[model samples]
Target chain A: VQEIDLGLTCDMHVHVREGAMCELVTPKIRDGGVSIAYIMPNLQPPITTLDRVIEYKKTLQKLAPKTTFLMSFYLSKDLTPDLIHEAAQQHAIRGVKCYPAGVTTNSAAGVDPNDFSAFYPIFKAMQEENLVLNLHGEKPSVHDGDKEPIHVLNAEEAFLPALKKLHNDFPNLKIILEHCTSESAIKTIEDINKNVKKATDVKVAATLTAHHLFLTIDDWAGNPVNFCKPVAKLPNDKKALVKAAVSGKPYFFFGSDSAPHPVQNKANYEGVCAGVYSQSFAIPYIAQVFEEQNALENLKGFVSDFGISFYEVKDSEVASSDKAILFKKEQVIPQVISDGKDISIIPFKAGDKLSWSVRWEPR
Target chain B: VQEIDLGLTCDMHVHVREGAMCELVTPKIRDGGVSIAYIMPNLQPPITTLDRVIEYKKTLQKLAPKTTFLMSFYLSKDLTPDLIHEAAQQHAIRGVKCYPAGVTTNSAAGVDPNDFSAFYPIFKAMQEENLVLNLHGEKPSVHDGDKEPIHVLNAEEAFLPALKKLHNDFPNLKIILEHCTSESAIKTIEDINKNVKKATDVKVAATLTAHHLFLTIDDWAGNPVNFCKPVAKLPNDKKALVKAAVSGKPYFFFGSDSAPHPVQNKANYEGVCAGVYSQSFAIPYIAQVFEEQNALENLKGFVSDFGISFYEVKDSEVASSDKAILFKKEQVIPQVISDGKDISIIPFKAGDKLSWSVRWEPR
Candidate 1:
């Protein structure tokens, strides 16, 4: 294929971060072939209120004026039913990102995944308002008794039950098991969407990441650059992820959780930041995988269409009428994306070659 | 149980590398309560020659006069049968360490793990000369088909077939699967030794490491300080290592595999050196695990008797007649072992408190 038009490519999950880091990576959403990016709410002080999320969206939109920045509120006690309704009425947020406490970056202001019964009112309002709920699906805390141990390898697997319960309790709610890294998640997401008559009716969906498609526990064993929350699992899990991505399943769409930390933070002997910076080469990294699996025909569905449909994101809400054009132009991923002012992010497969490059064109 | 007499403690797998690193960590052998330390040969140009082995031992002896330094030849084309005979005759080296190429640090000159058939002559000579064949058992190369993938999580398990083949072909040859991390390895070693009539007759054995008992993949997911080759496996694998350590089994004993890297190398986002600097708190760390498992009675056998007996180290060959004494004195492990020069090592479990401390007393 000389050129494949990935129509208005959407990345359902991303973390552009704050300040200098945010400035450096925000423009990368469009640069990485993502026209519409659902932003993560995990910042210094999480984006919980409508005022903060609106301001946050305004901030990111300025960075990449052509790129659609879909905002989210960080789920916490500060979030109320009225706020969700008001946010929905104003189209202030695409979703509310629920992070189990202490899971990933800046999640101290997050809620308890165990018994989200307390947030039933908030969920009801979101469900009534047709808002999506993005879940950082992982159990960070350890399980003592009869329950299986909740370590990095099995953390995502352990959280599958919670995902199912959320979907069951609020079946009308739109929930996404964001950046899922396990085979169990793939199966659960597929199972949930099995009864759905239409692709747009996927009540519970999963967002697969570009890095997870290529990594397992082995890739990150000694290399801190590949490390992230719900760390890439075993070889079988990676295979499962690639399979899910290429299976053309509506629920399994692209979400490059392209989290960026300063090189200093990532290069620590202890307490290394948990993230992989893949934003700079997001589509090419993903396209390379699809090309490997010989499922190039399904690329548009996984990367461009499925995510947009699930979130019900409108073209009117988008910043531009541009489409992500993936071409057969081979390029090497840069070792570091930096401006040399005390900020450098080592990308996921830094220095590696990709067979595809993405460009933007008006549809 | 104030103090336990751990007679002539030995750590059969340790890498106190050359120059600054060697000088800094060599004395830590005795400080960590191991009277005997079997040093690894993976250096700048690994120690394969007799002249190099003798000089290396002499240097380490000068650094820690009382700590018995049992040397080994790096398994390579450079090692001839005659060299092994001469080394065994002089007792210059206790064993020949086989590292599968590209598995860890300084293993570039290492041999291929796939076909050790080429080294049959070397194995035969070592068998006849009564020298142990120490295997850093792992296949780093990715498997293509029917073969399960050779990844960090299952690299050891993937190499088990090679280990079993080696043992079957050379039944009398003393072979140790160094730093056995998984349940598969423990079970394999146990299965091989099930026929042994006496502890002295056991030809196949395994060396359990101090850090492997405490870590799984989760521990090292974000913490590069805990990273090491045959990288700490899953929860079940760690449990197996800890269980095997305290099982009072003759084949299961301590070989800390206490490799040290400069703080910079360890603190890298990519290409982080594989090792754990457990040499400083080796015995105390081992004791804490033994105590946790309620198998303090078996600690001496693991750290003291088994390895020494397996190697057949006479008392006269020992540098000192001192015995390592384990006492219940809680102390915090130092953050870094450095002389404030260009050299600094972040010891494993830095800033964590260990319940046991070691003292040496003359017999």
Candidate 2:
């Protein structure tokens, strides 16, 4: 089978839930040929302070050894501008990630985005410091009624009012709508890009996840592993995401959003955790999606270049390699793995067949 | 707190899995004041023959000894017109339930509805024998493709063309769409009821589940227990379902569709079985939804009269009680029950609060 190769890449969004699962991320990242990942800050007692942000990075460095992690500080009502200034000075933090209260895992302390005025100062500080503002981009309070409550499928779209308000208020802020799962999200970014002056440095973009691109609410049939907050939406949403991803849109790039949950947390009655452990299979799955779209040439921009330029990280920060990963037409995903004790995980596309496989080719 | 009384009820759709769990159904049915249930036919190997249909009824009769079961035979390609004739002669079989292939548990043998011509002979036989044709209405082949592959939410809607064709071709057929989960399903029935000649005895209706009436796709966010076949659709769908149920529409009535699975089958890595064990809370939950709609009077029609009239079973088949069943405004739902060994079943709304309670008057 002829193989198409995409060079070193990066995941703009990810979560390696603390402890045993934490040690698992790096190897998977490198195996997927991803040199870096922008690690999410939502952990048990999240990475709120500059010290914890650096400490989390150190932990990831010690565990993965080969992969570099760009850390973010969790946005909380208590966060101060001085802390952002200090972190920015040291280049210890890449962004400030906001989660509306109780939106997803470990986000109980998240501030309410409804009151946009409340977080204006934070956005202002992020703008001045040139730190990208990453958002979970969902409104929790779109009420239909208790009798027939609205589905979370509309949660991301419901956040549009707030998003428009945020963009209107901070026109110069660099904002990244993390894990954009719907067409409305992509359209919102497209509108923002169109309305703003092209010559200006003010940048707005959305990150597309491999799971979101490959699966929709249709795929969740009997599969809790596909469950997530801002749950994969209708086929139309997946279509919109694929269109945006393959369009070579400067504003759209790859983010695996490879959040891992232990098997108990995932496949459980207590509650199915909202994340897919896709770090291991991301690159091949992404390549498969792009190939299907007949946008194979744009794969490099989605997986490697656009994200680096958007985040404005030093190109040298990416561990370069002359190596190219080869993708095959058919591949089998490995089943769930454990840390050999209490912790275990069911990875995305587990036991399912993907149309592509990745192999490293050395120069 | 005060109480509201609703008369005897019937669950037009339900799944009491075989063996120990099957034995558990009648007691819960009687306790919830349901006099009869149209027991589903999709079981291990399925209840296809007349002998097995009678045998299954005997098993249920022996268990609780009070509640009545209107047994159905699984529709199979092998079921000949003569067998249907023999079953019709016996009066033991109430209906022939058809599940489109791979729609739900124990339904892998389900026939494809796309080629309705193949099933035309079966439908003709059912119509001739004056037997009711029950359907799990979903068309699996409706293509949106991987980009926007059809959502299970729209599966029922997607089956509309086939439903219309069936109604038109077999104008004399008695048909009931089981667990109608969307507005499209409801509207189809409405259109059929309106356009067809009222002089003829042919009947077409849709069953509404308490789970569908009370929950939407939103409820399945982090909850696997709420997940089921035809999954829950959008809020507008739920709103339409509620409107139909409470409007006292004869075509719409209660069906718990309360299929129970062992805890292991439920909260698992292996596919989360696509059935909700809402039987334990089905009655109270049903009562609560109707009350919220301010249609408490219509509760009797939805939960009792409409289904009984549609099935055309003798009124005496339902055991009557002079004792009134009191429904409290709020109640605690039982957590989980063990089947004496490794099989423990998690009832829907386990450890969750229900806003209504049912308690029979003192004897």
Candidate 3:
């Protein structure tokens, strides 16, 4: 097979974590050859304020000078239109994130899907400013007195009503439903597209993560490391994700959601934190998925063009280096990243070999 | 509430490992006051031969002198009627275990359901000798090949055809479907009862695990320790299992497939072994479940009476113990059992406390 050129790829969603862990992943992001990453706000004390966003961006830029880091502020009851406006005004801030309360890591400060009415002003401000609303689309803990626990796999579908309300309430709002894991979720996005007369007005899209696209319920049947929030759905869900990604749909694009947990947390019996650390090998994995689907020709658009166009940051001051990465050879994924001490994080597909590897060159 | 008395309960399905691990689990079983355990045969080399069964029984007796260890021989392609008859005649063998190839831990020597015709002679011998056929009832793999991996959750239902065939071919055979996790599996077993006018002829029953009765897919969504084979089903499945067990039905009985792995295997990132170690707190936890269902009156039958009656060993040579365990107080489940070295086994509800505790006393 001839070498494939993936042009200026972007990982639209990622969790680069904080401090030492952040430093550890910076090299990994560069190594994956991701041009820009939509850094997630779900970190310790989360990036809620303009000051924190600025500081986080500075740290990211200093750590990985070659790549661009787009910042997002966490959504909460405390968030106001003024905060949203201030965040939007900042050139570094690209989006605002909303996580269902208690659904994922550092999500204690997240808002209820039902509380969308209260947060309408903030959405309005984001809509007016043309900033993206990235959501961890899931419902909070549901209580039905049979005493049987919540169905987490159904959480995404449960959030569907809330999603519809949000879109209808703010038709002009551009929403990125993050890390979708179900076929129903993909169909919901498609349904919205079908209902909307113009794509520019009622903007609704979903991010396809590397783990969700490449792995399924089977992959994690015996492995906890592949476990993540919105917990990779059934086989049908995975196939739907692959179909959505390779269909060359402008709305469906790459979002790594490459969340990292300390090796200790993952290598735990009880309360193992959810998230797959896939940033290290995400591009190659995504490429491999696309290649397997026989849609390598559509890869460049899904990874780069669509996202840049959707974000409307294609013509930003960041110079177009006209660069691309050549992928043809196989590469081995490192089992664990360590600091020669107790700090270690195991990435997705760790200790396994990837069929595709990237080599980026500047033009 | 007054203290509940559970008389002579049996853990009909359990894996007490070999050597050190077996020694570690013995006291835990005694502490939980399980009078007897139907020990699984899936050891490293597996207990297939008459010598291995005799030697293994001696070791189990040496370790846990107070409790009875009913041995089972692993079924393989090479398993013969002569071997089954020899093992049965020895008095140590109570059941013959069958696992589908590559289904779970150390199941490489397992037989295919399609090859039941070839193994019919051994089944015939087991039936003639009145020995139970304990099955790890699950299909090894499903090959729909949509590029989506097979649903391990549906493994039980997939093996239903083979189960039906086995029952029909040997109507006189006494079989125990071990650790059933799906509603369809329960339904299939019930369908047999409905079809058979005489229950004495087609004696088919299923064993309920504490994990399946007390826990559901929800418990293991975030905890690897709760992960087990037939990989805990949805809420509907759990509800069905609960209903079947507490329905005062003779076909449903207790079998704490309380298999354990050292903390490392379960807590590891990849290749986590499937099975919950509930031997430490199985009885009380089961009692709590029965109490929740308002079927506390049936607890004795489900836990002790039904299993012993189904095994047809209620009048066996083993002395009938009039001993009972008192459960009224809550007990904390230790997160790890330290062997003063690198050996540690995490039991179910590890680091958590159960609302019930047991104290056995001879009456």
Candidate 4:
């Protein structure tokens, strides 16, 4: 079993709420790793305003001096050509983040469904400006009570119709499906990719999350501690995400968004938090999963190669001695921790630090 | 000049979000009116199982018996036919509420876009059962930012499309537009009212609150106290609502959704509550508006007539003439009393009382 830090770093996913500033944390170079991460703009206050965008850029300078932090040009409420033109001038802003309202956490700001018309000119401008759109896809599932799994498949439901609509309207708009979890979500990506490949030069692909790759409904306890806003689903969803992660579909890859939240928030039902902490153990977990499934070769493609190439980021030349990592020892599972109290007691799931941590080694 | 008591009732929008069981409430009834009001089903621990629904029903019955509570039969997440069938059998369950995911609040358990194909059979069953679906419109704008005035319009975008898709499929379905507050929202209701007039007996009407009728963004500051959410819009919206109210649109009627928050909550920004405390003053304020606009003819239609007609409740023979109430000469501004620093403002413009009031008529 071989493990590696997704060394060539670009998070391609970081949320900066509207108006608020966010610092792009450089993965610890001496210990953690050296990498850049794309900042997402689907914030509570919504990073929709350009003034806010400029402020966010200023924050990047102070926070991530060593790493290349790419800013996401937030999609306008009304995606106008002029707005696109204005955003196009910003070089550091690589892509636009599109949250179709209620897709996931903090996506209160998003575009309307009827007015994709507003976006056509913007798409043309995007093609001209060479910007990408990282999409959090999920249709409005207005009110489905207790079919928890129904929500898990929301992205595909909303996206399929949208893909068909945008197919004609914004052919050249580069699209990246962010956090592709369910099989249905993957299918939507593949379907869109196929249509786009035939129709436009738009390079379309999907970024899967570690939570989807590993967790399912079974993972949820009372308060749903591991419950990210995009509710996880049945084993079928888990299996599909795993397949997509390992599949050489050119449309699939890993985006280990090990987003952490205060422990209190996750364990409670009031704000069933949407992030999962996996950075400390993500490498060995993925490696272990792949090794068990005999898809070790696909591991690198998912964690390192796919994302780096997909985002057009230059690969880092880093090396480390550890070839493989494993949980040589296991630990007790608690009913409730300070914050992750609702998490189930998955006995003996404690992971031991392996030979290969997701550690950064200097070139 | 005669004076009388302004009686009011409430619609307990029963909802549970994660841990908090929020009873989105209106002012309790003080005088002349029927027994009960509407109850919402956007519960968190979503009232999925029959046991849960029964529990809610029993809770309301034992707790608030005088109020004629109409509880929504949940539109299950997966749209499972059995669940819908089971929900239909519950004698107390009056209507089924459908929230498309990404649409309105607490719709995490809403249906998928494809008319809940998995649950299509359940919808079909609703037709057979002679039940109604209380749809929370706001689909197209589900992804739109929370504060976007367009959120209301976008919901209609989703509603009309979905209604169009399923109008024919479920011939017997009676659909009510729940908590509508957009100009486009009114148009969509009329559109549906027209479209479904002859074809499928699917009666589409909406519930109007004091928020839309009296509150606008303009009212936010002086009467931030007046703000109840689905974040109220401009005077233009209020004008539209008044027009609809006067027009005596069978589809549009008064729902005294006098949602209240304690003084502390109403003041705090973090949880600054979004509900108007107008149940106590609903009739007086509404009457005053109509009187000022010289549309008193329309006032009765909006308040007493429409809801009764739509819900087909028996009109009370006991009209109170003696209750022809006094218009408070002092502009008491339907506002929260100043608890030291916090000035409690009531929705429906606290200071001004209407000319007419509900009276105990001389038999």
RMSD of each: 1.6, 3.1, 2.5, 13.2
Q: Model 2, range A1-363, lDDT digits (tens) per residue?
A: 867666657789988867767876556877766777898899888787877887878877877775767889999878888888889889899899998888888889998776868777777888899898998998775554564233487778878888877877887788888899888888888988885443234388889998888787767757888887778877778878999999887788899888888887777864777788888887887888887889889998899778877887685775445444655768788787666877777888888888777766654
For candidate 1, the docking band is medium
Model 4, residue A244: distance off in Å is 0.8
Q: Local distance difference test, per candidate?
A: 0.88, 0.79, 0.81, 0.54
What value does the lDDT take at residue A103 in candidate 1? 81
Ranking by TM-score: 1, 3, 2, 4
Q: Which 10-residue span in candidate 1 chain A carries the lowest summed lDDT?
A: A141-150
- Candidate 3: where is the Cα deviation over 4 Å? A143-149, A195-202, A319-322, A338-343, B1-6, B143-149, B195-202, B314-316, B338-342, B351-356, B361-363
Would you list the rank order by lDDT, best first? 1, 3, 2, 4
TM-score of each: 0.97, 0.92, 0.94, 0.46
For each candidate, what is chain B's TM-score? 0.98, 0.92, 0.94, 0.72
Candidate 3 chain B weakest lDDT stretch, 10 residues: B315-324
B167: Cα error in model 4, Å: 39
User: What's the residue-level lDDT of B179 in candidate 2?
Assistant: 88
Identify the candidate with maximal lDDT: 1
Tell me which residue pairs clash in candidate 1: none
Q: Which of the numbered candidates is closest to the native, going by highest DockQ?
A: 1
Tens digit of lDDT per residue, candidate 4, span A125-200?
7778878877666665432344332233353555556655664566655677777667776776776666443222
lDDT of 3 by residue, B22-107 (tens): 78887677777688788889998888788888998888778877777788989886678988888788786998999888889999
Per-residue C-alpha lDDT of model 3 across residues A159-244, encoded as one tens digit per residue: 98889888898888889998899999999999988864432434888899888887777778678788898888777788789999
| Error of model 3, residue B42, in angstroms | 0.7
